[PDB]
């Protein structure tokens, strides 16, 4: 089993944000499983591993681009297939950063729901 925490980042401000601005921290712990796979879940996933996607603001409907940070992606142990579906895997008992993807984004003041699916993997 996995103990999963997803923690939103404090002090985010509307307007032009820094490239790769951190917006949430994923924390996955386990006493029994060595690795986990993770995918973003939304109405518009934009890559073949589910590690970048778009999310809509609750009050405005404006979209922002979100995903695992470049540093987090470089920490992946592997990309494995679960009945043909790609999941990038990472060490359990570790944290990953969810960020605003790509070049600087101009973010409208709003609340943006971020949803992830995490699954245990034994390598």
């Amino acid at each position: 089993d996995l103990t999963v925490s997803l923690i939103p980042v404090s002090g985010l401000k509307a307007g032009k944000n820094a490239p790769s601005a951190k917006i949430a921290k994923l924390v996955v712990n386990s006493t029994t499983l060595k690795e986990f796979g993770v995918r973003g879940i939304s109405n518009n996933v934009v890559d073949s591993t589910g590690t970048a996607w778009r999310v809509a603001g609750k009050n405005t409907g404006k979209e922002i681009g979100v995903g695992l940070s470049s540093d987090s992606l470089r920490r992946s142990d592997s990309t494995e297939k679960w009945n043909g579906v790609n999941w990038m895997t990472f060490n359990s008992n570790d944290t990953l950063d969810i960020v605003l993807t790509g070049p600087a984004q101009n973010v409208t003041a709003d609340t943006y729901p971020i949803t992830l699916d995490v699954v245990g993997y034994q390598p």
């Binding site: 089993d1 996995l2 999963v4 925490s5 997803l6 923690i7 939103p8 980042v9 985010l12 401000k13 509307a14 917006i23 949430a24 994923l26 499983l33 796979g37 879940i41 609750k58 494995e80 679960w82 999941w87 973010v107 409208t108 003041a109 709003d110 609340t111 943006y112 729901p113 971020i114 949803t115 992830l116 699916d117 995490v118 699954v119 245990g120 993997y121 034994q122 390598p123």
Partner: peptide, 19 residues
Amino acid sequence: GSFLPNSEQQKSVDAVFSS
């Protein structure tokens, strides 16, 4: 290697950008 289907979880949080 193998995935453990019973361990799959969905987690959600809100990122709030303020003026």
